[PDB]
């Protein structure tokens, strides 16, 4: 949980 | 209120309108314009903190690069290799190669290829003289192999300003600077990136169509494990309303950036980008920053991008737990069919 | 192969058939019979380890209780309170009260009520003499407040045998023993329990219709946060094939347990249980055991109950993360609509 | 993960 709403860092590169 | 990107701006020195409507492609959806403000305007700062798009007309963010062009860059951009995508159509759908494994039934529409700047300029000069239908798009991160003048110009960017932005917004580090050089008419289909981006226009004009995070159900992104992850499955030129019904409820914010403008593309916001038709080649350098970290206690209800983050994670979890990405859909369907739908 | 529960067994001493077909309710689905084996039969042990139903005809598991009946129990079962569910219809859909919060729009079909055994026997004797349509069902765990003889009888159970089962199957501890006393015709709608169960029949006859874990998509359980969690939404008497299409692909294993029989109901297996029509009251004592723990490295692909476990957990996670159970469906729908379905 | 496929212990009681 809340370890759920965290994101990543992916971009179109 | 569907002004679009607004009326074509008048160029200084009565040099006529920068661009005109006929250079913009046509779409089935309506758009309202993104505010074009001054970096000193309190409203702009307001929009950035609130994570809403805004075109900043006077940052001087990439002032030194405004003199860039094919000859100049070729002249001293370095000897390194430049990633270059080619394609039959005007749409350059980005695909994650490391994920191509999962979907062996995916036929790339655009193919990548390393080469020397001078090579790109040639391949670009050939089609340009032979009137070919092929299209190219240079998308390369700015490394070390960069030329001496380019490194000089790079130092001329307005770091004072952008760095303060990184500090005020609590953003994370600058992950990279992508150099994009495209041919008039080129299109990057709607997708959303997971980082904060300052899109600084250098040469030519680009039309930017953005959509808020809460329009996730209208843009139908590909599955997280699919190569086209984060891209919209909807074909804007020919939207399939049968498969994508909610695409008829889509409303985007639009604008046309020109040399000197910096468009703030908030993290998770969808963006569709096109180089104006018959507008010549375009040059842009973007800045990517990891977003600010999750606050102590997450308030409720959740913001739209948080939900998108959650959905993304659920899909990744099922992908690992099930031991195979393709069983994700079936499990998800078995979960809702006749229970939640 | 759709023998059902098999032909009515012939009672010893030529006392005629124990029961007959007309006492069984009619349903739209087909069933194959559950093996009726001997505790000494290698096949039975085989089925138990493989987690497949099986009726064990000679365990003597609850030998001392075979003499139980209303008078005997009332005579010395204790003074404690006994949970007692009442209902208008013959279907006693179980509902989790602690979850009734989430769905304020749920109207209980069966209401619970504490009382003394002698009270249940009276309320039961009244309807029984006044020919009422009301139905009762005593479902109470066997506590401490138990009478002296009952505690004696309890000691007479075949712990040697059952304990070895708990050891061979690596099961966890015995969580409880539920005492169920129902009226002829009473039905417990299809549901699945999260524990291993040894269902020991004591008085009267019960028809048990079980379904394997892999028939999850045909039984449409209620949402995990709903009070009727783990129960099938499908009304067996009048199946709604529009909402529950896959219920037409349902195939269950059936059998009729009588005094002395023990039905192994594997964890996660769906079961529908009914007291034969005009068969008198029924008495059963079940044994619930936590299943064996998850193995070192989980092999692939997953077993059906593991997937069900996963689905259940995903729903619980979204329930907490979203801060509200009712947003689960919407998020799930937004996730698949036009992406995985 | 696998903290995913683990179960609970709920019965109709
Ligand atoms: O400018 C483009 O064509 C694509 C750029 C983009 O998607 C980005 O910088 O995030
Ligand atoms: O016997 C019944 O009526 C219900 C029993 C049951 O569902 C169980 O013991 O798991
Ligand atoms: Fe992007
Ligand atoms: Fe049960």
Residues B110 and B257 reside in one and the same domain:
yes
What crossing angle do the helices spanning C304-321 and B304-321 adopt, rounded to 10°? 160
CB B285 within 8 A of CB B260: no
* Collapsed DSSP state (helix, strand, coil) of residue B96: coil
- Per the CB < 8 Å rule, is D5 touching C298? yes
Do C and B touch (≥3 CB pairs < 8 Å)?
Answer: yes
Q: Which residues contact C160 (CB under 8 A, 6 or more apart)?
A: none
Question: Cα D8–C246–C4 angle (5° rounding)?
Answer: 85
Using left for φ > 0, alpha for ψ between -120 and 50, and beta otherwise, residue B262 falls in beta
The candidate with the shortest Cα–Cα distance to B140, out of B188, B82, B93, is B82
CA distances from residue C231 to C193, C219, C239 in whole angstroms, order as listed: 9, 9, 14
CB B181 within 8 A of CB B92: no
Residue-wise DSSP of chain A: --SSS--------
Do A and D touch (≥3 CB pairs < 8 Å)?
Answer: no
Stretch (H or E) spanning B329: helix B328-336
Residues B275 and B338 reside in one and the same domain:
no
Q: Which residue of C has its CA nearest to D7?
A: C309
CB B230 within 8 A of CB B191: yes
- Look-up: residue for tokens 């349903």? C27
Q: What is the DSSP letter of B99?
A: G
The C-alpha atoms of residue B283 and residue C299 are separated, in whole angstroms, by: 52
Residues B279 and B309 reside in one and the same domain:
no
Partners of C246 on chain B (C-beta within 8 Å) are 337-338
* Collapsed DSSP state (helix, strand, coil) of residue B243: coil
Q: How far does residue B54's CA lie from ligand 1's centre (Å)?
A: 15
Q: What is the DSSP letter of B17?
A: B
Residues C157 and C192 reside in one and the same domain:
yes
Q: Which atom of ligand 2 is nearest to the CA of C271?
A: 7
Query: What's this structure's resolution in Å?
Result: 2.6
| CA distance, residue D2 to nearest chain B CA (Å) | 7
Q: Where are the beta strands (DSSP E) in B66-166?
A: 84-87, 110-111, 135-141
The C-alpha atoms of residue B235 and residue C79 are separated, in whole angstroms, by: 72
Query: Residue B298 is encoded by which pair of tokens?
Result: 């997450």
CB B283 within 8 A of CB B180: yes
- Of C280, C297, C314, at which residue does a domain stop? C297
Sort strands B54-56 and B262-265 into parallel, antiparallel or unpaired.
Answer: antiparallel
Question: Cα B119–B187–B5 angle (5° rounding)?
Answer: 130
Best interface-test mutation with A: which of C313, C317, C321 has the largest number of A CBs within 10 A? C321
CA distances from residue C85 to B256, C68, C188 in whole angstroms, order as listed: 69, 21, 11
**How many other C-beta atoms lie within 10 A of the C-beta of residue C279?**
22
Residues C255 and C329 reside in one and the same domain:
no
The C-alpha atoms of residue C205 and residue C197 are separated, in whole angstroms, by: 18
Query: Residue B52 is encoded by which pair of tokens?
Result: 């809403």
CA distances from residue D12 to B103, B127, B226 in whole angstroms, order as listed: 43, 73, 41
* Collapsed DSSP state (helix, strand, coil) of residue B164: helix
Sort strands B196-203 and B282-289 into parallel, antiparallel or unpaired.
Answer: antiparallel
The C-alpha atoms of residue C160 and residue C59 are separated, in whole angstroms, by: 10
Residues C16 and C124 reside in one and the same domain:
yes
Query: Residue C236 is encoded by which pair of tokens?
Result: 């067996």
- Look-up: residue for tokens 């003048």? B149
Residue B46 has φ and ψ, to the nearest 5°, of: -60, -50
CB C145 within 8 A of CB C78: yes
The candidate with the shortest Cα–Cα distance to B79, out of B27, B118, B44, B113, is B118
Three-class secondary structure assignment of chain C: CCCCCCCCCECCCCCCECCCHHHCCCCCCCEEECCEECCCCHHHHHHHHCCCCEEECCCCCCHHHHHCCHHHHHHHCECCCCCEEEECCCECCCCCHHHCCCCCCCCCCEECCCCCHHHHHHHHHHHHHHCCCCEEEEEEECCCCECHHHHHHHHHCCHHHHHHHHHHCCCCCEEEEEEEEECCCCEEEEEECCCEEEEEEEECCEEEEEECHHHHHHHCEECCCCCCECEECCCCCCCCCCCCHHHHHCCEEEEEECCCCEEEECCCCEEEEEECCCCCCEEEEEEEECCCCCCCCCCCCCCHHHHHHHHHHHHHHHHHHCCCHHHHHHHHHHHHCCCCC
Q: Is the dihedral of CA C32, C36, C42, C46 positive or negative?
A: positive
Cα B124 vs. chain centroid, distance in angstroms?
22
Residues C226 and C329 reside in one and the same domain:
no
Q: Which atom of ligand 1 is nearest to the CA of B271?
A: 7
Query: Residue C288 is encoded by which pair of tokens?
Result: 């619930």
In angstroms, how far is the first alpha carbon of chain B from the final one? 35
Q: What is the DSSP letter of B67?
A: G
Residues B314 and B175 reside in one and the same domain:
no
Q: What is the DSSP letter of B295?
A: P
Q: Which residues contact C58 (CB under 8 A, 6 or more apart)?
A: C38, C39, C40, C260
Residue C42 has φ and ψ, to the nearest 5°, of: -60, -35
Q: How was this structure determined?
A: X-ray
Query: Residue B277 is encoded by which pair of tokens?
Result: 């038709």
Instruction: Look at chain B and report how many structural domains it folds into.
Output: 2
- Per the CB < 8 Å rule, is B337 touching C223? no
Residues C121 and C220 reside in one and the same domain:
yes
Query: Residue C286 is encoded by which pair of tokens?
Result: 């079940």
Q: Does B188 touch chain A (CB under 8 A)?
A: yes
Q: Which ligand is nearest to the CA of C230?
A: 4
* Collapsed DSSP state (helix, strand, coil) of residue B205: coil
- CATH code: domain of residue C340: 1.10.287.1010
Query: Residue C196 is encoded by which pair of tokens?
Result: 């291993």
Residues C227 and C150 reside in one and the same domain:
yes
The C-alpha atoms of residue B50 and residue B42 are separated, in whole angstroms, by: 12
Q: Is the CB of C268 under 6 A from ligand 2?
A: no
The C-alpha atoms of residue B324 and residue B328 are separated, in whole angstroms, by: 8
The C-alpha atoms of residue B339 and residue B173 are separated, in whole angstroms, by: 43
Residues C214 and C309 reside in one and the same domain:
no
* Collapsed DSSP state (helix, strand, coil) of residue B167: helix
Q: Does B141 touch chain A (CB under 8 A)?
A: yes
Q: Which ligand is nearest to the CA of C180?
A: 2
The C-alpha atoms of residue C88 and residue C134 are separated, in whole angstroms, by: 5
Question: Cα C14–C16–C22 angle (5° rounding)?
Answer: 165
- Per the CB < 8 Å rule, is C298 touching D12? no
* Collapsed DSSP state (helix, strand, coil) of residue D9: coil
Domain span including residue C76:
1-297
- Spell C155-182 as b/e; 16+ CB within 10 A means b: eebbeeebeebbeebebeebbebbbbbb
Q: Which residues contact B288 (CB under 8 A, 6 or more apart)?
A: A11, A13, B174, B175, B176, B177, B178, B193, B195, B196, B197
Partners of B335 on chain C (C-beta within 8 Å) are 311, 314-315, 332
Residue-wise DSSP of B124-143: HHHHHHHT-S-EEEEEEE--
Q: How far does residue C188's CA lie from ligand 2's centre (Å)?
A: 7
Residues C304 and C266 reside in one and the same domain:
no
Q: Does C270 touch chain D (CB under 8 A)?
A: no
- CATH code: domain of residue C166: 2.60.120.10
């Amino acid at each position: 949980l809340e370890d759920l709403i965290n994101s990543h860092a992916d971009v179109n590169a | 209120v569907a002004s679009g990107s607004g009326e074509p701006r008048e160029e200084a020195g009565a040099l006529g309108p920068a661009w005109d409507e006929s250079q913009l492609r046509s779409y089935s959806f309506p758009t309202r314009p993104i505010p074009r403000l001054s970096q000193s305007d309190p409203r702009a700062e307001e929009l950035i903190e609130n994570e809403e798009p805004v075109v900043l007309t006077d940052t001087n963010l990439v002032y030194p690069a405004l003199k860039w062009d094919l000859e100049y860059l070729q002249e001293n951009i370095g000897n390194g290799d430049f990633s270059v995508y080619s394609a039959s159509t005007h749409k350059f759908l980005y695909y994650d190669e490391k994920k191509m494994a999962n979907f062996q039934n995916f036929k790339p529409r655009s193919n990548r290829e390393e080469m020397k700047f001078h090579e790109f300029v040639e391949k670009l000069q050939d089609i340009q003289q032979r009137g070919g239908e092929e299209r190219l798009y240079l998308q390369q991160t700015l490394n070390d192999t960069v030329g001496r003048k380019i490194v000089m110009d790079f130092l001329g960017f307005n770091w004072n300003w952008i760095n303060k932005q990184q500090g005020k917004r609590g953003w994370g580090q600058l992950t990279s600077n992508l150099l994009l050089i495209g041919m008039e008419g080129n299109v990057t289909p709607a997708h959303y990136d997971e980082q904060q981006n300052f899109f600084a226009q250098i040469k030519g004009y680009k039309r930017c169509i953005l959509f808020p995070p809460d329009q996730f159900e209208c843009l139908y992104p590909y599955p997280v494990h699919h190569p086209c992850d984060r891209q919209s499955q909807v074909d804007f030129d020919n939207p399939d309303y049968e498969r994508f019904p909610n695409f008829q409820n889509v409303v985007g914010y639009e604008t046309v950036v020109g040399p000197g403008d910096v468009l703030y593309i908030p993290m998770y916001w969808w963006h569709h980008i096109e180089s104006l038709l018959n507008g010549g080649i375009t040059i842009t350098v973007n800045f990517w920053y990891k977003g600010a970290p999750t606050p102590k206690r997450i308030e409720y209800p959740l913001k739209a991008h948080q939900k998108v983050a959650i959905m993304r994670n659920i899909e990744k979890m099922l992908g690992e737990a099930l031991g195979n990405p393709q069983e994700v859909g079936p499990l998800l369907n078995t979960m809702i069919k006749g229970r939640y739908n």
